Amino acid sequence: AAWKISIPYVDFFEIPVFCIDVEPEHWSVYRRYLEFYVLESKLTEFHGAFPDAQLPSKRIIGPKNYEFLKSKREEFQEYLQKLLQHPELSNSQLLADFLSPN
């Protein structure tokens, strides 16, 4: 996974979602706030616990706030980006699955 990702915006599934563009091959995937936290949970389970690569404290929000997802947009982007930089994860199906279309 020498993949490049960005989270240009947050969108709606009608339900506010993160839109991730992935790189010349390209596509986008839609991920719910919660989906990130289970990703991090599982990844940490099978691969350890990369400092630097840390999701912010999970908020005890309810569906649905748009503006809140908008604000975490950058942090979440940084997370995935720093994730992709570690090896060991370069072969994680978990990560790959997370980043695959829709």
Curated annotation (Swiss-Prot):
It is found in: Lysosome membrane; Late endosome membrane; Cell projection, Dendrite. Residues 8-102 form the PX domain. Disulfide bonds: none annotated. It comes from the Eukaryota. Widely expressed both in fetal and adult tissues. Plays a role in maintaining normal neuronal excitability and synaptic transmission. May be involved in several stages of intracellular trafficking. Required for autophagosome clearance, possibly by mediating the fusion of lysosomes with autophagosomes. Binds phosphatidylinositol 3,5-bisphosphate (PtdIns(3,5)P2), a key component of late endosomes/lysosomes. Does not bind phosphatidylinositol 3-phosphate (PtdIns(3P)). Belongs to the sorting nexin family. It is linked to Spinocerebellar ataxia, autosomal recessive, 20: A form of spinocerebellar ataxia, a clinically and genetically heterogeneous group of cerebellar disorders due to degeneration of the cerebellum with variable involvement of the brainstem and spinal cord. SCAR20 is characterized by cerebellar atrophy, ataxia, coarsened facial features, severely delayed psychomotor development with poor or absent speech, and intellectual disability. This is Sorting nexin-14. It comes from Homo sapiens. The lineage of its organism: Eukaryota, Metazoa, Chordata, Craniata, Vertebrata. The gene is SNX14.
